[PDB]
Subunit: 111 residues, 2 copies
């Protein structure tokens, strides 16, 4: 263990400080989220661990200082359940796929 100095050590189940949190699945309006560029679907999307896609609404881009940056934090304000009606679509997803589109804004708070 000769390569590091240990400056402090903490154990326990909770603290008085609350880390900043993001949703990663089953997004709800009001959630704080991480918004990343999805090259394959040519769109910004929510970072997520689940296979349902949450696309960022194109009209939310100017409110997140984005342009049609790798990532930004935002706060979900609207959410739309959608189904692909034509086999070639703005979302590069097969015909009939069900997915979400979300509107988000920049947010300088940790909640």
């Amino acid at each position: 263990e000769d390569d590091i100095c240990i400056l402090n050590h903490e154990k326990g189940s909770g603290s008085s400080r609350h880390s900043e949190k993001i949703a990663i699945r089953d997004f709800q309006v009001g959630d704080l989220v991480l918004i990343i560029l999805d090259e394959r679907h040519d769109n910004y999307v929510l970072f997520t661990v689940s296979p349902t896609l949450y696309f960022l609404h194109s009209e939310s881009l100017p409110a997140l200082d984005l342009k049609p940056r790798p990532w930004v934090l935002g706060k979900v304000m609207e959410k739309e359940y959608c189904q692909a009606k034509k086999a070639q679509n703005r979302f590069k997803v097969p015909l009939g796929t069900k997915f979400y589109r979300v509107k988000a804004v920049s947010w300088n708070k940790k909640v």
Copy 2:
């Protein structure tokens, strides 16, 4: 448009249901975190947007069913460290301050 059909539309500030959530910086003991492989640093780390590295303590790998590409965990312990040698296990410059955490699985 005409490529998508809108099945429902929701707007608001809150809901009756709680999405699964992870800490993303300034991690605290008790936090739910996302643990990912960081090959640049030859370690697992906590997924984060801050520039401070939070390495997973090698002692925690068996509890998370990992060996020395992502798992959800719960922070049980955290240590503030400073790299003391130029060549170290964490592949950071000499003097770098960073964290090590111990975590257990969570589902």
